[PDB]
Design a protein around this ligand. Structure first.
Ligand SMILES: CCCCCCCCCCCCCCCCCC(=O)OC[C@H](COP(=O)([O-])OCC(O)COP(=O)([O-])OC[C@@H](COC(=O)CCCCCCCCCCCCCCCCC)OC(=O)CCCCCCCCCCCCCCCCC)OC(=O)CCCCCCCCCCCCCCCCC
Ligand SMILES: CCCCCCCCCCCCCCCCCC(=O)OC[C@H](COP(=O)(O)OCCN)OC(=O)CCCCCCCCCCCCCCCCC
Ligand SMILES: CCCCCCCCCCCCCCCCCC(=O)OC[C@H](COP(=O)(O)OCCN)OC(=O)CCCCCCCCCCCCCCCCC
Ligand SMILES: CCCCCCCCCCCCCCCCCC(=O)OC[C@H](COP(=O)(O)OCCN)OC(=O)CCCCCCCCCCCCCCCCC
Ligand SMILES: CCCCCCCCCCCCCCCCCC(=O)OC[C@H](COP(=O)(O)OCCN)OC(=O)CCCCCCCCCCCCCCCCC
Ligand SMILES: Nc1ncnc2c1ncn2[C@@H]1O[C@H](COP(=O)(O)OP(=O)(O)O)[C@@H](O)[C@H]1O
Lengths: 139, 80, 344, 51, 52, 319, 63, 120, 47, 163, 97
């Protein structure tokens, strides 16, 4: 776990390799979990068919992970501004686009871009403003 | 009612006994001269060791010695 | 049911939650849960229709394995602390088990699959008990142990439930299952504030009980398990159309009615505790719940669906009345909001 | 008051209303005359500045 | 607990046997009877947050 | 009203039942002089003789009991049934569906009298026998296939709950002789009815109703001659042994629930109003609202029995 | 009745609302402190009854 | 929360300590609301059961308006206590742990210099 | 009238007397509680 | 030996793995009856004569036997060859060894030492299970009452379900 | 004990995986379900026995008494199912979809 966290430790826009690798893993992990629920429920017809679906979901998710990581890191590199929700949005923007392609739908890319990017941007803001998620009870 | 028990004693002569001894055993303890002793004969048994208390001189009853006339003397359990 | 059996069962279904609540020795809390499991199964199959046996056999397996997991937590604690009860020191995994298990008996989040299906095959009446007098027991166990449970998991089960409940409800047209889905959702809010302010869980429950109990006795007054069936309410009994309208919008969070308070104070407590991430997403999809509530509103009240000719025959005959509880629980529920400060 | 009991509903509301709005004053009467701009000293045989 | 019908009624059907230092049959103290005592007479009047 | 309280404290149906206490239906063609037999058998064992279900049987059942206006009673005409078969508006199916609801009310009222008073029941044609009219109607162009399915669905949903007729009587007279019986009775609507349609009605009984019920209940077939001799038929009923049938398992604790059902008319026909939208059955919201907003304004109907002052109810302010 | 009544009424309304506001905020700080501190009557979580221990002569030395 | 407080009455409704607090005026708007809340329950019942809405069950109407209200006085009497305990508890802590809740000096605006953003 | 008479035509006179009488017991206990209460409050505090 | 318990514990896991591969309804009943025998033995190891025998008396022949009984009546349709399961089961037999192995090298360990009967009075009586189980009638008489209702309302629950 | 207590716990998890991965016959499940109760009964009895905590031995049995009835209910549902379908396969229990 010390791993994933590393993504945040190094300043954004720097060491994109690590960023892309980490982001790709998270997506892939989600892919596995997502495929699992998708196979446990709404099962397949043959073991192979399901192994394929696991692969499909895993790769698609890994891809959205990569492009998000790559775009955000590079956008920051090229733009030279490390702290900017916009970097992430461009990244989320891209991530959605990959999802759209994998699903072969321009429309999905639309919602995907907006919704996904917005979400990622909010993550950046969240980190920048020190928003706390799942907080301990401090009442 | 009393003559209904007469066929139930001729035919079905089992449940009668089973509801005549089910109960008999609930009234024998409440009405016996000797039911007091069951919680007492069972209370006398020294399974674990009796820890002695330190003497202060403020305790007259506590029998100083195992053979003092004082203390829980059961001349009851004997010839109960 | 030989009225004697009816008494024994009903007593158990009622001794079941009560032992849980009263006792502190967890073991005695487990058997309280166990009784409830044993007492509910006979009533569930009263019609003994083929759907029913399916319902009970699912409810029982889901309930039984969860009961065994809760016992394992108590057994493990016994070896990590001689006590028969969770303490500050309790291993975190020990408590998380209890959360998952108890979240299965209550049917929250990723374990929300059994409830909609058992709510579909049981009568409307036993539906209420299965939804509201069987949630009191497990929740009691959680509320007692709140200081020790994890804020992260609860929140995830909370948010998930809200979403699953909402999304599930949108598609459903069977009423029993629309309610099952709502209960999953409301149950979610309840478990969201447990780690922070248990006292509000007990409000978000009562209000749910004071809202759902009138709503179901409404569904059964005409025994309609279909929206199409409840839509002809205007012909079968016109007066309940007004309150059915407000109670369902009350079940969702719309502001003038009593239903806003549970969501409002839960949001106030979560923001007081800084979960302005979590609270926001919950409130937003909470709005999805009202969409399916209002879609039903449309069919039952705001628009008059066409009825069959035989409906005139049922009008002729005097309609067996709805118990008084409906009224007292419809009003105390649709409009108590002006009295919120004292409720909390 | 017969057949006219539905004409004296709203009017009565007004009176009750005025009864409350003059009662709210009674509650919010701190700083009765303790305000800075309007802190005159009580004129002879006058109980309080504003009621 | 959630509804303390036990303290109110004064009955103690569920409290007498919750810890290892409770009355054991025939006064056969369990292992640790010494400690648990020392760890619960300590945390008595001090709430958990400060029993921890 | 009857409740588990009453059941717990006495009030058991079992102790109110006697040999003469049975559900006996007599079924025949459009004209079997059935009415007489029933009233005759009724007179024999004091059986409450229920009349054949009618369009306004429910209105006679409820409140004042004065006959309702046709549109209030579902706008059904047996008269129009005959003069306009295969009508565009489908009055014939609406007539049949209302008839099934009426006998459902009659059968349930009959069962309530049977389990409460303990007096046996004679109700002429029953819900079980109603299907013969629809079978014949579908056999000719009167009703279309789905119409049939909708009636069958209502029948499957409601009829099983009620216990079967103890015995069924069959007053049979041949297809030709009923039409001459029809010819002399005066109404012209009964006259000119299809001989083939009457053929399909009695054939449907012989092919389906009597064999089916031949196990569920003691069917007593009687030819016309045996008929018109209530004494003999009555004798035979008193002769048959009420053994075979589902009635054997009706313990008191089982009857209670059945009683509480018939005790609630709103439930008896709950499934009669199922939201299946076949076009003939549909009220329609605008017409239905007017018909309800008009039926509900009739004196004594605006409010529940006992509370409407128009008909002379009093004490409303304390009820 | 006058300008005097509303000015003095509005100041009374502000004092109630100002005092209510200060207290509501202090509650949130007190409630943060007692939860973590556990040194105040609120948030005093339970530990087992001392009344149920048994300091009576056991059956073995060294309890 | 407030449970676990010293002296807590394990199952009591309103401890006698609540005697010290003023009793709720019977005409307290709230109790009067509960009354109206009640009358409506009554009227609603009549309606759902199809009875003359206002002219029926004039005995029930009373049971309702008088049951709800009865409940109120004794509930409000408590909720009032609960809130009152909350202050006893809250104010006390502010003192017993004074340093944590220190009095603050607010510089007269003369001294403080909030920046001025011009609208222009 | 009605072919099937109402069950409610002449009032359930018990339901009146436990409904009316119950409410009058409520008040006499409620009003009592208040004045009694006011006193306890006055004496328990200064006045 | 000293590994008196471990070995047994290992056998208990094997029986549970057999029930877990869900073998034919009655072939596995045997499996339970096997691990129930095994669990009966372990408890005896620690001195719980009564508690132990109890299991061998109630779960073994009472519950389990009734279970298969019903299997025979239904759900013993005896329509995957259990042999395939035995094949897998064999895999687990040693697959579990793998799980243990990692911790085996990691190592308590070296069989089982004094990790049983921690403390026993080298003198004294009345120290024996069944004195504790008999607290149902002194100082723990609420567990006894609630168990009663379980079985008692059990009768009524079963018949009602059966009917 | 610490070592053994592990085996029993994993036995309960292996029994957990069993009841959470059905396959055909239900009677298998119920049977598995029981495998847990045995593992819980064994673990509760074991620790109670090495803690010399005799005040708690009541529990090891209360666990079994409640578990037995629990199973009684479970089997009556099972008999009810192979009376309505006669094959007791978790496979046909899908009407509620
Ligand atoms: C009509 C029947 C009237 C019967 C009158 C009987 C005689 C009588 O009561 O007169 C003396 C008596 C004397 O009162 P008082 O205490 O001298 O008045 C001075 C108070 O300071 C003045 O009162 P106060 O402001 O100090 O009261 C405290 C509190 C009192 O709180 C309340 O009582 C709220 C009442 C709301 C109505 O204030 C509030 O109302 C806060 C809540 C405001 C509304 C919050 C909710 C808004 C959204 C929801 C609106 C309602 C939605 C209902 C659901 C949807 C329905 C379709 O008059 C009353 O107490 C009743 C006043 C009116 C009550 C509401 C009636 C409606
Ligand atoms: C300089 C101008 C730059 C404009 C950039 C944004 C628009 C770029 C459009 C590129 C072409 C996209 C396209 O053609 O696909 C439309 C998309 C899918 O449409 P579909 O029904 O799948 O058929 C497509 C068959 N080739 O259907 C969609 O989902 C489109 C989603 C994106 C819409 C972009 C324009 C939105 C305008 C909103 C205005 C609000 C005021
Ligand atoms: C609040 C206001 C938000 C306003 C956002 C406006 C965005 C408008 C974008 C242009 C319109 C695109 C659109 O409406 O398409 C709907 C789309 C049609 O279907 P299609 O794209 O062919 O794919 C079907 C997949 N089941 O239907 C779908 O594709 C639905 C499935 C794809 C969902 C894409 C969005 C996923 C977002 C993930 C966020 C993760 C964080
Ligand atoms: C905060 C404000 C919240 C919103 C308040 C306003 C909306 C109230 C809720 C309305 C919800 C239902 C809307 C659709 C109703 C349809 C009613 C209908 O179709 O008519 C039949 C119905 C029953 O008929 P019946 O009384 O038996 O006799 C007539 C037979 N045709 O006829 C009836 O039902 C008659 C009785 C209807 C209920 C009367 C309610 C009057 C309006 C209440 C306003 C309350 C305002 C409160 C303001 C608070 C401010 C702080
Ligand atoms: C991330 C988290 C991942 C969690 C695991 C997810 C696993 C994937 C879930 C979806 C799998 C795809 C759906 C189909 C799965 C399936 O069919 O297997 C069920 C299994 C075999 O039994 P049956 O139901 O008859 O299936 C035969 C199919 N021809 O039925 C059973 O296996 C019954 C139990 C016997 C096997 C386990 C016994 C315990 C011992 C296990 C040792 C390790 C086994 C590793 C495999
Ligand atoms: N389901 C039905 N559909 C159409 N007509 C029906 C139905 N049930 C009864 N009838 C009508 O009932 C009439 C027979 O009743 P009838 O024998 O004259 O009564 P009674 O028993 O008084 O002699 C037939 O003309 C027939 O049209």
């Amino acid at each position: 776990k010390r791993f994933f966290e590393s993504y945040h430790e190094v300043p954004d826009g720097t060491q994109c390799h690590r960023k892309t690798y980490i982001t790709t893993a998270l997506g892939g992990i989600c892919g596995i979990i997502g495929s699992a629920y998708s196979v446990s429920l709404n099962p397949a017809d043959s073991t192979l068919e399901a192994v394929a679906r696991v692969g499909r979901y895993t790769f698609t998710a890994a891809a959205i992970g990569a492009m998000f990581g790559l775009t955000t890191c590079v956008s920051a590199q090229v733009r030279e501004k490390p702290d900017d929700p916009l970097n992430y949005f461009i990244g989320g923007c891209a991530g959605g686009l990959t999802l759209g392609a994998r699903t072969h739908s321009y429309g999905t890319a639309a919602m995907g871009c907006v919704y996904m990017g917005t979400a990622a941007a909010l993550f950046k803001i969240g980190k920048l403003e020190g928003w706390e998620l799942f907080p301990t009870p401090k009442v | 009612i009393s003559a209904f028990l007469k066929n139930a004693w001729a035919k079905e002569p089992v449940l009668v006994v089973s509801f005549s001894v089910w109960g008999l055993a609930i009234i024998m303890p409440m009405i016996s001269p000797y039911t007091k002793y069951a919680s007492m004969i069972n209370k006398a048994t020294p399974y674990n060791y009796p820890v002695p208390v330190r003497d202060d001189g403020n305790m007259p009853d506590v029998p100083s010695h195992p053979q003092d006339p004082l203390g829980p003397s059961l001349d009851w359990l004997k010839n109960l | 049911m030989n009225p004697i059996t009816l008494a024994i069962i009903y007593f158990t279904i009622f001794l079941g939650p009560v032992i849980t609540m009263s006792s502190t020795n967890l073991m005695l809390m487990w058997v309280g849960l166990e009784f409830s499991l044993l007492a509910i199964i006979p009533m569930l199959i009263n019609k003994k229709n083929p759907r029913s046996t399916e319902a009970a056999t699912k409810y029982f397996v889901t309930q039984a394995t969860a009961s065994m997991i809760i016992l394992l937590a108590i057994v493990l604690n016994y070896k990590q602390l001689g006590t028969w009860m969770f303490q500050q020191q309790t291993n975190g995994l020990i408590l998380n088990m209890t959360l998952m298990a108890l979240s299965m008996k209550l049917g929250l989040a990723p374990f929300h699959f059994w409830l909609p299906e058992v709510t579909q095959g049981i009568p409307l009446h036993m539906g209420l008990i299965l939804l509201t007098w069987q949630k009191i027991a497990p929740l009691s166990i959680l509320i007692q142990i709140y200081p020790l449970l994890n804020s992260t998991i609860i929140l995830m089960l909370a948010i998930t439930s809200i979403f699953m409940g909402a999304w599930g409800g949108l598609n459903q047209t069977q009423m029993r299952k629309i309610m099952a889905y709502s209960s999953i959702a409301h149950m979610g809010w309840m478990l969201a504030i447990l780690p922070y302010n248990p006292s509000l869980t007990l409000l978000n429950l009562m209000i749910y009980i004071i809202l759902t109990a009138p709503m179901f006795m409404a569904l059964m007054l005409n025994n309609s398990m279909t929206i199409n069936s409840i839509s002809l309410l205007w012909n079968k009994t016109p007066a309940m159309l007004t309150m059915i309208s407000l109670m369902l919008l009350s079940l969702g969070g719309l502001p003038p009615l009593t239903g806003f308070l549970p969501k409002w104070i839960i949001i106030t407590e979560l923001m007081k505790n800084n979960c302005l991430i979590m609270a926001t997403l919950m409130a937003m999809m909470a709005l999805l719940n009202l969409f399916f509530y209002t879609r039903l509103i449309y069919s039952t009240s705001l628009t008059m669906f066409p009825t069959n000719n035989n409906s005139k025959m049922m009008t002729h005959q005097t309609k067996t009345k709805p118990n008084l509880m409906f009224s007292t629980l419809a009003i105390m529920s649709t409009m108590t909001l002006p009295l919120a400060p004292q409720l909390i | 008051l017969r057949e006219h009991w539905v004409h004296i509903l709203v009017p009565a509301g007004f009176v009750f209303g005025c009864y409350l709005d003059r009662k709210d004053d009674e509650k919010l009467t701190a700083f009765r005359n303790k305000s800075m701009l309007f802190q005159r000293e009580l004129r002879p045989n006058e109980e309080v500045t504003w009621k | 607990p959630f509804l303390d019908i036990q303290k109110k009624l004064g009955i103690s059907l569920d409290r007498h046997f919750m810890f290892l230092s409770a009355e054991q049959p025939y006064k056969n103290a369990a292992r640790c009877h010494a400690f648990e005592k020392e760890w619960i007479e300590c945390a008595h009047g001090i709430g958990g947050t400060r029993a921890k | 009203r009857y409740g588990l309280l009453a059941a717990i404290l006495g009030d058991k149906t079992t102790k109110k039942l006697h040999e003469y206490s049975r559900v006996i239906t007599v079924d025949g063609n459009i004209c079997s002089g059935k009415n007489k037999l029933a009233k005759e058998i009724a007179q024999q064992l004091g059986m409450k003789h229920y009349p054949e279900a009618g369009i306004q049987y429910s209105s006679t059942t409820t409140g004042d009991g004065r006959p309702l206006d046709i549109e209030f009673s579902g706008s059904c005409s047996l008269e129009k049934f005959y003069d306009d078969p295969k009508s565009n508006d489908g009055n014939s199916y609406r007539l049949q569906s209302w008839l099934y609801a009426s006998r459902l009310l009659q059968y349930a009222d009959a069962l309530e009298h049977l389990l409460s008073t303990g007096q046996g029941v004679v109700l002429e044609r029953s819900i079980y026998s109603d299907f013969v009219f629809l079978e014949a109607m579908y056999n000719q162009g009167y009703i279309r296939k789905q119409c049939v399915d909708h009636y069958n669905e209502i029948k499957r949903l409601t009829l099983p709950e009620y216990l079967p007729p103890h015995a069924v009587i069959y007053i049979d007279v041949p297809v030709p002789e009923v039409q001459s019986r029809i010819q002399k009775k005066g109404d012209p609507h009964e006259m000119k009815v299809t001989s083939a349609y009457l053929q399909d009605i009695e054939n449907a009984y012989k092919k389906t109703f009597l064999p089916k019920m031949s196990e569920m209940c003691e069917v007593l077939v009687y030819d016309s001659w045996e008929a018109e001799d209530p004494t003999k038929v009555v004798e035979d009923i008193e002769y048959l042994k009420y053994n075979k049938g589902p009635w054997l398992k009706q313990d008191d604790w089982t009857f209670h629930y059945l009683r509480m059902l018939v005790q609630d008319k709103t439930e008896v026909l709950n499934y009669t109003t199922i939201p299946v939208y076949l076009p003939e059955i549909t009220i329609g919201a605008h017409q239905g609202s007017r018909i309800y907003n008009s039926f509900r304004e009739l004196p004594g109907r605006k409010y529940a029995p006992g509370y409407n002052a128009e008909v002379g109810d009093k004490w409303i302010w304390l009820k | 009745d006058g300008p005097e009544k509303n000015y003095e009424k509005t100041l009374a309304i502000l004092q109630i609302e100002s005092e209510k506001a200060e207290l509501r905020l202090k509650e949130q700080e007190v409630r943060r402190l007692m939860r973590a501190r556990g040194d105040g009557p609120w948030y005093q979580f339970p530990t087992p009854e001392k009344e149920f221990i048994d300091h009576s002569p056991k059956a073995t030395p060294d309890n | 929360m407030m449970n676990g407080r010293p002296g807590h009455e394990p199952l009591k409704f309103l401890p006698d300590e609540a005697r010290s607090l003023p009793p709720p005026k019977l005409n307290d708007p709230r109790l009067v609301y509960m009354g109206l809340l009640g009358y409506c329950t009554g009227l609603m019942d009549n309606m759902l059961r199809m009875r003359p809405v206002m002219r029926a069950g004039l005995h029930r109407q009373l049971l309702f308006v008088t049951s709800f209200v009865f409940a109120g006085y004794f509930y409000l009497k408590r909720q009032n206590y609960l809130y009152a305990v909350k202050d006893h508890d809250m104010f006390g802590y502010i003192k017993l742990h004074p340093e944590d809740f220190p009095e603050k000096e607010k510089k007269t605006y003369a001294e403080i210099l909030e920046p001025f953003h011009p609208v222009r | 009238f009605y072919v099937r008479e109402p069950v409610n035509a002449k009032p359930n006179w018990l339901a009146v007397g436990l409904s009316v009488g119950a409410s009058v017991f409520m008040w006499i206990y409620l009003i009592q509680t208040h004045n009694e209460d006011v006193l306890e409050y006055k004496r328990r505090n200064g006045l | 030996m000293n590994n008196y318990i471990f070995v047994l514990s290992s056998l208990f896991l094997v029986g549970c793995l057999g029930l877990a591969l869900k073998p034919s309804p009655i072939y596995g009943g045997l499996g339970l009856i096997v691990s129930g025998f095994v669990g009966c033995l372990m408890v005896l190891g620690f001195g719980g004569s009564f508690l132990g025998l109890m299991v061998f008396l109630i779960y073994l022949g009472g519950m389990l036997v009734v279970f298969g009984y019903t299997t025979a009546m239904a759900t013993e349709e005896y329509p995957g060859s259990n042999w395939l399961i035995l094949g897998f089961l064999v895999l687990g037999v040693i697959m579990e060894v793998f799980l243990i192995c990692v911790l085996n090298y990691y190592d308590l360990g070296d069989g089982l030492g004094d990790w049983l009967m921690y403390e026993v009075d080298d003198v004294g009586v009345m120290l024996e299970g069944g004195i504790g189980v008999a607290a149902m009638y002194s100082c723990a008489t609420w567990m006894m009452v609630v168990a009663g209702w379980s079985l008692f309302a059990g009768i009524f629950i079963i018949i009602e379900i059966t009917r | 004990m610490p070592s053994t207590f592990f085996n029993l716990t994993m036995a309960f998890s292996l029994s957990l995986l069993g009841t959470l991965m059905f396959r055909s016959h239900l009677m298998s499940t119920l049977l598995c379900l029981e495998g847990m109760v045995l593992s819980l009964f064994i673990m509760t009895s074991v620790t109670s026995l090495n803690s010399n905590s005799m005040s708690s031995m009541p529990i090891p049995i209360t666990i079994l008494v409640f578990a037995a009835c629990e199973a009684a209910v479970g089997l009556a549902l099972l008999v009810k199912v192979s009376n309505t379908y006669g094959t007791d396969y978790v496979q046909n229990l899908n009407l509620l979809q």
